[PDB]
Amino acid sequence: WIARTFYDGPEKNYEKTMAILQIEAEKAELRLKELEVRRLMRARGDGPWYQYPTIDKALIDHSPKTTPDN
Amino acid sequence: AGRIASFLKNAWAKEPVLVASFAIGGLAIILPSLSPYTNYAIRINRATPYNYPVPLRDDGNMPDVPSHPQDPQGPSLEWLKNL
Numbered sequence A: 001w002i003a004r005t006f007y008d009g010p011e012k013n014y015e016k017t018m019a020i021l022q023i024e025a026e027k028a029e030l031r032l033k034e035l036e037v038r039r040l041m042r043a044r045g046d047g048p049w050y051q052y053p054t055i056d057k058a059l060i061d062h063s064p065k066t067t068p069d070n
Numbered sequence B: 001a002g003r004i005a006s007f008l009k010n011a012w013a014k015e016p017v018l019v020a021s022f023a024i025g026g027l028a029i030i031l032p033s034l035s036p037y038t039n040y041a042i043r044i045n046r047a048t049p050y051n052y053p054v055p056l057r058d059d060g061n062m063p064d065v066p067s068h069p070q071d072p073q074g075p076s077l078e079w080l081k082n083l
């Protein structure tokens, strides 16, 4: 009676644990991957991250400048 | 109406210098936006050649660009002579 009215079967807890373990394992591997990706982008600068501004080339004036040699 | 004229008349007495200064400053602020010769001053400034006019390499597609200074096309300064 106690088992019937207060508790559930073992399969429920077993499969809930399986799902929880999957979630945590993927989170751990994602954390490692993100750390490595951040390190690579900060070192190489070719990624979307750690992009530091440079001078906009639309500011340059391309006209004759009173002297032939610029 | 009456109050403003009374104020201006009271200022023109015992304070004529301030009245004159404010009138002259307001005229300086207002008149240039109404004068027709301000655009003439702008045109005169744009017509003063400080730099060498660098020629364009011709490609056969500029009817409006002269080949010689004597050629009719190009900006003219007859209006400036007229002034």
Ligand SMILES: CCCCCCCCCCCCCCCCC[C@@H](O)O[C@H](CO[C@H](O)CCCCCCCCCCCCCCC)COP(=O)(O)OCC[N+](C)(C)C
Binding pocket: A003, A004, A005, A006, A007, A008
């Ligand atoms: C001879 C008898 C021998 C056995 C004695 C049994 C004693 C029972 C009282 C002790 C209870 C222990 C604590 C249990 C708390 C948790 C129970 C909880 O899990 O059950 C919930 C229900 O909780 C109960 O309603 C709590 C009962 C609280 C009262 C206990 C008895 C004493 C109450 C005294 C009140 C006095 C008031 C003043 C009177 C004047 C519903 O659970 P649920 O999450 O759906 O479960 C899903 C699985 N299902 C679907 C199979 C169920």
Ligand SMILES: CCCCCCCC/C=C\CCCCCCCC(=O)O[C@H](COC(=O)CCCCCCC/C=C/CCCCCCCC)COP(=O)(O)OCCN
Binding pocket: B011, B015, B018, B019, B020, B021, B022, B023, B024, B025, B026, B029
């Ligand atoms: C919007 C244009 C502005 C630019 C033009 C002005 C350039 C320079 C003028 C401004 C300089 C600063 C002015 C500071 C004003 C001080 C006023 C003041 O408090 O002094 C009064 C003196 O004068 C006054 O009463 C206050 C101002 C009264 C009104 C003055 C003229 C207001 C506008 C008049 C002209 C309006 C527009 C022109 C129309 C003219 C008519 C054709 C008190 O005298 P005290 O020295 O303190 O002596 C105390 C003991 N008696």
